[PDB]
Amino acid sequence: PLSGKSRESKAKQSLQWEKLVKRSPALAEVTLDAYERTILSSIVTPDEINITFQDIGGLDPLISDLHESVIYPLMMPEVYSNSPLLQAPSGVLLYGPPGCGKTMLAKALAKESGANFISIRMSSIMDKWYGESNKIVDAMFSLANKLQPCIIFIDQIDSFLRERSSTDHEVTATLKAEFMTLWDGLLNNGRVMIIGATNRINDIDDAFLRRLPKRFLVSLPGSDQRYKILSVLLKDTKLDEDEFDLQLIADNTKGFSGSDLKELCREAALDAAKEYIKQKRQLKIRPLKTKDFTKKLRM
Amino acid sequence: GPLSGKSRESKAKQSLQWEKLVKRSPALAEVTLDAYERTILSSIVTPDEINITFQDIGGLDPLISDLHESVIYPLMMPEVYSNSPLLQAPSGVLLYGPPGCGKTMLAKALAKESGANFISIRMSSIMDKWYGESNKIVDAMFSLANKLQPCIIFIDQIDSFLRERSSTDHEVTATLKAEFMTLWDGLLNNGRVMIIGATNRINDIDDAFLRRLPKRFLVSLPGSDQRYKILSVLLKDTKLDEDEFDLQLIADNTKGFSGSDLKELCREAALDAAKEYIKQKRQLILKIRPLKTKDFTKKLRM
Amino acid sequence: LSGKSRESKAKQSLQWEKLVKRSPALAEVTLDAYERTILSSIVTPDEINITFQDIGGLDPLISDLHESVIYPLMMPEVYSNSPLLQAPSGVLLYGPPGCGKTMLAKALAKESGANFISIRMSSIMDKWYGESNKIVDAMFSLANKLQPCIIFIDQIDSFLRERSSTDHEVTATLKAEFMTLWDGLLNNGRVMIIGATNRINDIDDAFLRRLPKRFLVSLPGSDQRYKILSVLLKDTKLDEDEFDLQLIADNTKGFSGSDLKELCREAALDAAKEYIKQKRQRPLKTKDFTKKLR
Amino acid sequence: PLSGKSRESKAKQSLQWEKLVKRSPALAEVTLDAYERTILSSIVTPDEINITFQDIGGLDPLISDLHESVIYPLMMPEVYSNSPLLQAPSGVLLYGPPGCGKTMLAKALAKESGANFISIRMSSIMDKWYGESNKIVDAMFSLANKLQPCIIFIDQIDSFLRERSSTDHEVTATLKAEFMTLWDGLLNNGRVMIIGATNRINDIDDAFLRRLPKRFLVSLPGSDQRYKILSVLLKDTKLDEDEFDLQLIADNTKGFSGSDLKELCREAALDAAKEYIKQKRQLILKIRPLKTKDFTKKLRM
Amino acid sequence: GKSRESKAKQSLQWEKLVKRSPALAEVTLDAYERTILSSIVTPDEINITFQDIGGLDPLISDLHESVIYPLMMPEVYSNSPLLQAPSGVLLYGPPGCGKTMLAKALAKESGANFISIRMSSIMDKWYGESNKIVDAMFSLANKLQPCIIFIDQIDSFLRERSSTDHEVTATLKAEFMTLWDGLLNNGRVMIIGATNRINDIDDAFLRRLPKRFLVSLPGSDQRYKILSVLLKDTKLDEDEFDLQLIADNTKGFSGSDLKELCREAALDAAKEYIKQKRQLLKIRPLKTKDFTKKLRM
Amino acid sequence: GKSRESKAKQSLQWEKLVKRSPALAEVTLDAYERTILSSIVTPDEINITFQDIGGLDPLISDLHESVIYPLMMPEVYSNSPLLQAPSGVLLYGPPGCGKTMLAKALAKESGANFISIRMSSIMDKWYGESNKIVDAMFSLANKLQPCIIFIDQIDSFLRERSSTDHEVTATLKAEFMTLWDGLLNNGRVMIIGATNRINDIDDAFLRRLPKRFLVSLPGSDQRYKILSVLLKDTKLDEDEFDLQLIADNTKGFSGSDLKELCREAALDAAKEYIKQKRQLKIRPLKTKDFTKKLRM
């Protein structure tokens, strides 16, 4: 193990295992090894994510495609048992320009999708002790198999699954080989699926990119997609009907990512409520206007 | 006395795999093992654990027949070949090629249909942080493969295990790979042990390890007829349209598609064609409509 | 790990005690070993001599930075009415060198009231395998533990370089880990990562999106040069009639804040050499400034 | 605890000891330590080897040089006792490209040469327990001295004797230092010679390379050498009297190692006889004589 | 192991056993059996009811239906030979959960004669004394026919056999394996074990413990039941006290952790009354707030 | 054990126990119990008051009202069964703080019989002797009913159990777990332990230590209080001496660091008086002596 020895890590693992058993009572009889228990600290429950698929704007076709091709085949195998071709992908890639909502879809998958979610970082695998990283990867796949509808999420997967080179470190090379062997090898994986989000799809190795067959292009939002982005972002605000012209705001945000639109919303909200902020600091928020956004917009 | 592989579930897996091996070959009941060989026993792959036969791999029929006549028959039927010393099975086999073209499929078919005892070894079973334990693990792997006399030591992604040795290589990894070369082809040669590897990067393998893999199978990208064969195999046990489905057009337009790409395309086509049935069943919780060429070519890029 | 050194352990204990004195609620907080090593990089108050009143020219940028960064972060009760009023996840200071970005970070460290972590590439890279990623993860977990926290990366162009094949494996996986913790599945608390850079094109786009609030600390305007000269020449004897700051500001064309500092230092030093000579054996005037001007 | 705790290990050690005493009756009076008993499992007898010096083709000058400079100075010291310089080397390095015949020569030294053979491996040397590896190395040298004409063969010796650095393990550092001391130190090994085989000679430490002073370069075969290797491999195999032309195959196999030629011969015999095995498998008469085309169809030409 | 206090304890336990079961009277005991008699646990020495263990009701029911009733009432199960009592029982799990509570309730409410043996009574410095002690333990257990031999933290006694073990430890383990299941099999004797490290137990020793109970960490409803049991005969506020909130917010808590939390909460709630009593009505009824001060949410 | 000096010490401790608690008379102790009796410490041997621990006043009060009063005054806490004393107490934190100081103050004036055991007493070479020693330790602690068994540096004794541990250490730990919380539970016996490495302690052993006190490094106010306590019964200047400056510049210091600083400052301030005495009063302490050694 050599990572779940600390008392805080053991407490985290017990919390996550208790949550998993509460969600799936059949997991009570499932026993884990020390390395699998080390992986348990990477289990991410729907309670940790405060983000629903409803908070995703401009990706409704992508969400429906993701559902009907990924979520339901993984989560409803009885429905899809008419043909053996109706299966969940062995991997899923969410690739696109930065700020368009790949990790948003990952958070919604952690929350809304029934699948147990393991979000694994490189730091939780790379161990300086010899041969520990490969055992950690093997136990991650073993634990994902034991929690049978599991999703292994690797954020920024381009670095994890980088094109193998002769200059790669030995432990990294054995890590990548072990991941390729367990991901698709002699021994099949039962309803275990790997999800990756990345900005550079070309940095991913060809043999790793092959193991991510279902790829979702979370591209820069269109005009309508920006309209839905703004509608989702300015939820739970004033949004006066006469003072606000959302369509003009959406068309003025040419080449704007979702994170940039969040920044624009935050700036406009801070500027519009600044008088109320000063009054509250000394001791209502004015309706949001197109003037505030247009002042913050370049146009 | 290895410090790893002594877990209770690991011991249960070793007992189960040994039971399966003894049931397959009753002569192995008298065979005794050391503890390190018992930890190697967890990597034994028994034919019931594999769902893939040689009939499930399409477009590699010349390769499959060549693999049979040059690898499987000289190893599994030595009495037929016991007339010339040059008719012996190769000491190693390399299935190399672009990703997704069917190397693990051939490994699965070798584990199932060949009848050789199969050890699929991963590096996490070999690397041990304790000093001189990886070498003992490798020695036990070769000793166990010699005890189960017709054996295949399969190492998937063997280009990482048998990578080009260098001065920057780790000490334990260097002695591990040197021990692997010594046991693979050295003094006291193995009886009927064959080491099969699968790589995407053949040029990453060391020259000495490569020499020890004299039989090389290039599982290259499929051609038009080969892609038709893969599409026909993948679309078996599935309702297909009559006088409307054009598999030849799909195979022709899938230029550069590996077998995994065709598998994903077939999966997506089945998901698209059955979507109305999926909705109807979800409402409950006709049948799947026959797959047309328009269904395949909708998402197929030309 | 750097926590083996006796001096490093003493520094970590001193920084932890300063943090606990600042925030008494941190007494019950336990830290990992890697977070303890990150504790050596923490810049508590009463170490920085730079105040927000010590920066001239960029006072509108100071007020904008306050109202958009410090108050949203340090006063969540005022901004808690709406979920769009939270502090930015990242803040960028970019422009030409010598314009006061480092003082802006220093005044933020002294005056904002949030715990300040100043990290560097040299203090983040480790010799062993996987220790850099664990160190980055501990940095983010520590910044979450000290709930109002500002992580500073001076010369953030090098730390957040655009990813390419020429980058080392350790650096690439470090940057990916930084991305994952900065904006990933697990939302951070009131953690803000701030960097000062000279080149804005060297920053990765996926790291630029993580710095939504960008402040252009550019070359000063003429009124800004006047404010800079007034701040720099404070508590200094100046002539009531001979000294005139207007033409000093007007003649300084294409001069940054560091260049204005250099001009002020030379003008003060040529006059103070006479005082040193008198000691061995006069207010500052404009003519000394104009002599060095070209 | 000590290594080799298996009952099969005890059976192997006792069998090898009985073989050694049968070969040389003088060894019966020699008592062994526990670690020397564990080293006894690495004893290689000529009955375990089926490769003689006649099975190695294209290396006749190297084989004769190896004999007259290594085997005869060691196995027949009476002849060489006239001069103190006429002595066996402290070590022998068989280095070269992979597949060229170094392990063939080691097998032939184990079989034909009368020296007791210790084919040691790193799995029988390295031990996790403290100080056991050094005692194993010491007892290896003690046993080699007891079985007085002895060859300690370490295959892939570039990993055992790799260039020492500050990054090596403490156990390996003391292991290498103990091997260095016993190999060439104060106390003199009588007729113990350490033969090594490697592909990377440059990976060996200079202080260990100087302990392997008789170096044999088993290089890639020439056309004459390839002809001899093919003639050796194709012996006791039916070949065509007229259509078969070995010289053309030898000329066309440029850069082919001995292993490459062995694989070529194996696949040529498989494809040439393929009608015979098909009939036999149908049943379950005569193998067709091998022709030039059988090697040509498997060659690049 | 002979001393005046120990001899008095042995005599007291023997009269307790004789008064409990008249058949056990007029039975000759060896000196080593007499020494083993000091480890006999009687029902009055245990203050734990089966009702004092909450959150394990399926485990209590399974224990009664598979362990206690087959051992205690063979007459009901006499029709089929397959309904016999287990040779051994293992109560394994993480520390904190009620393995010792289960063992205490077995010592009090199963009705079997109980031998709670410890390593001090078994291990003996002199030659061959420990094996004779184990032999006498099994002989005494056979003499009191419905006997339970409870070895708490049984992973230390039944640890995996190795060469590094002492000669006397290996002989002890082999003697225990021989008497546990060998020739001349025992009567209604069951060796109940409790441990945290099940993997440390030897394979043959685990084989001799067929019926294994996993007393895992409590779930939310099990925590609610444990908190309800621990707060029995304790005044609780009618409206302020919310036990479900405390059960849901004590994630990862074992039963011992809940006991300590309840003790600390009671102390904090009754601090004012305790100070008033020390310097001179009743303890203040416990609220949710008292537990949430100590809670880390 | 089984020595003339050892038996004399055991007899002396037994007379001290019977003198303090008259009900302990006519109580028979086994040979191993008599051996454990040499580890009994008494208020005479400990010359440290709870008032001699500065800065830890909230910890002192918490320790009192949650440990000492529930253990030594059971009549007050009688009505509610949940008001019992903890089965164990752990004092953990960085070295230098008052963990042993707290243990000494508990040994003096908590009123409990104290067994300050060390690993030389418990661990024995002979077979089964250490388990019998632990059993007799618990039997003696139960006999002296309000007892406290203090094990300084308890991380080593209660370390995480492993199969690579010696069989006697594993058996010793299992016996300690069984007697600490098992069948036939102890009376008013509490196991207090001090450590710097709480993470080294086993999960079952840490479970058996429910009450845990973090004696962390002193703050500025705590440093002032510790300096005031350490500089008691010594002469300090009325005008030159200011404790707040020294407490401010002693950043990151523990109590031990302050004790050594105070000792160095006292030596340097009394150096000339000591030289005069060696040739043949104490100069009042000023801030110059403390800030001279201080590196700020």
Ligand SMILES: Nc1ncnc2c1ncn2[C@@H]1O[C@H](COP(=O)(O)OP(=O)(O)OP(=O)(O)O)[C@@H](O)[C@H]1O
């Ligand atoms: N489809 C969307 N719906 C709603 N908000 C969105 C959407 N896309 C982006 N955003 C906003 O922009 C932010 C982008 O964060 P996120 O982590 O999802 O980006 P990303 O696409 O994964 O980028 P990167 O991989 O570079 O981190 C979100 O937190 C949200 O505030």
Ligand SMILES: Nc1ncnc2c1ncn2[C@@H]1O[C@H](COP(=O)(O)OP(=O)(O)OP(=O)(O)O)[C@@H](O)[C@H]1O
């Ligand atoms: N010739 C084929 N016939 C049928 N299916 C195939 C064929 N080739 C590949 N596939 C499909 O591709 C999937 C992946 O297994 P495959 O054997 O292709 O991996 P691989 O070729 O070893 O590539 P990698 O080295 O990247 O693992 C299989 O599930 C299989 O369904």
Ligand SMILES: Nc1ncnc2c1ncn2[C@@H]1O[C@H](COP(=O)(O)OP(=O)(O)OP(=O)(O)O)[C@@H](O)[C@H]1O
């Ligand atoms: N507004 C200002 N008021 C006073 N001095 C200033 C101001 N701006 C810059 N300076 C001077 O510029 C010098 C250069 O440091 P400064 O903080 O400006 O660097 P910077 O803008 O962060 O540049 P870089 O990225 O090259 O480090 C300072 O030492 C300071 O004297």
Ligand SMILES: Nc1ncnc2c1ncn2[C@@H]1O[C@H](COP(=O)(O)OP(=O)(O)OP(=O)(O)O)[C@@H](O)[C@H]1O
């Ligand atoms: N000179 C030769 N004559 C006949 N056969 C040869 C010759 N060299 C090699 N071979 C064939 O190649 C096979 C392997 O050769 P060998 O094991 O000696 O390789 P090597 O030179 O030791 O390389 P490595 O050090 O990588 O093992 C032998 O079984 C033999 O049949």
Ligand SMILES: Nc1ncnc2c1ncn2[C@@H]1O[C@H](COP(=O)(O)OP(=O)(O)OP(=O)(O)O)[C@@H](O)[C@H]1O
């Ligand atoms: N299921 C439960 N119901 C009620 N109280 C419990 C339960 N489990 C534990 N407790 C409380 O916790 C205390 C300790 O529990 P117990 O003695 O069963 O643990 P243990 O099995 O000895 O731990 P270990 O596994 O470390 O030996 C008991 O005094 C009891 O009050």
Ligand SMILES: Nc1ncnc2c1ncn2[C@@H]1O[C@H](COP(=O)(O)OP(=O)(O)OP(=O)(O)O)[C@@H](O)[C@H]1O
């Ligand atoms: N709170 C305090 N008030 C006064 N003096 C103190 C205090 N804490 C420590 N000291 C000084 O430290 C000395 C004892 O230190 P102590 O042994 O308690 O440290 P510790 O934390 O127990 O060390 P360790 O954990 O390494 O055993 C005493 O002589 C005392 O002068």
Ligand SMILES: [Mg+2]
């Ligand atoms: Mg992202």
Ligand SMILES: [Mg+2]
């Ligand atoms: Mg594959």
Ligand SMILES: [Mg+2]
């Ligand atoms: Mg700067």
Ligand SMILES: [Mg+2]
């Ligand atoms: Mg060789």
Ligand SMILES: [Mg+2]
């Ligand atoms: Mg217990």
Ligand SMILES: [Mg+2]
């Ligand atoms: Mg102490």
